[PDB]
């Protein structure tokens, strides 16, 4: 979901 977990 990516480094900052912004992919829901």
């Amino acid at each position: 979901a990516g480094t900052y977990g912004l992919g829901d």
Epitope: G2, T3, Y4, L6, G7, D8
Partner: antibody, heavy 116, light 113 residues
């Protein structure tokens, strides 16, 4: 890999403005996105971040409740609504996507001038 | 709010030279999940910022290996082994570990004479 901001303009103190960011060259609905602005002194300030679906929004104290980030994944477009603008909001406004870092790729920016 | 301070303000180099830029935080950027979200951005004159390094030492896609990031806790460094014309511009560090997200004030890589 293409990000194009728009909506920048001359606006009076107290006024409002809606910025847009048209994206292409990647899966739009996969990435969280952000707005960052550059003031005339060339300082960078993080303005807002939104999750891939639009479910989650994040703001610094300075613009909380005054700015609103949103997105339309069907139209591959990111938005920034700004209200009660003051001279200090005069800046270049950049949209970006996040993956490996906070802002992996940046657009060319759109210019906002707040003045009467 | 954690503060990011960069030194020096301006770094005069000759093309060919090694360069070192420092970035310090007012508090530890080490996140509770074990990561340190320290990032470096380059803004070339008249252009938008670009990502160079993320998570302290990971080079972003396309970034040549003459760039290297290091450091820990509060003290961080970006090094350039041999400076090329394309490297001239303003380097900003960035922290993503703590709320709110913050940029350093920038370091200008410029020409020595």
């Amino acid at each position: 890999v293409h990000l194009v901001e728009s909506g920048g303009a001359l606006v009076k103190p107290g006024g409002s403005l809606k910025l847009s960011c048209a994206a292409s060259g990647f899966s739009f609905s996969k990435y969280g996105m952000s707005w960052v602005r550059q003031t005339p002194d060339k300082r960078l300030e993080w303005v807002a971040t939104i999750s891939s679906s639009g479910s989650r929004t994040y703001y610094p104290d300075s613009v909380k409740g005054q700015f609103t980030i949103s997105r339309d994944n069907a139209k591959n477009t990111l938005y920034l609504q700004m209200s009660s603008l003051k001279s200090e909001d005069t800046a270049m406004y950049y949209c970006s996507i996040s993956w490996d870092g906070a802002m992996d790729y940046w657009g060319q920016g759109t210019s906002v001038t707040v003045s009467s | 709010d954690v503060l990011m301070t960069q030194t020096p303000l301006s770094l005069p180099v000759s093309l060919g030279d090694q360069a070192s830029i420092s970035c310090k935080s007012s508090q530890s950027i080490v996140h509770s999940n074990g990561n340190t979200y320290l990032e470096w951005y380059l803004q070339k004159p008249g252009q938008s910022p670009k990502l160079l390094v993320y998570k302290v030492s990971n080079r972003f896609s396309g970034v040549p290996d003459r760039f290297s990031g290091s450091g820990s806790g509060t003290d961080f460094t970006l090094k350039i082994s041999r400076v090329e014309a394309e490297d001239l511009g303003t380097y900003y560090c960035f922290q993503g570990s703590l709320v709110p997200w913050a940029f350093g004030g920038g370091t200008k890589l410029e020409i020595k004479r």
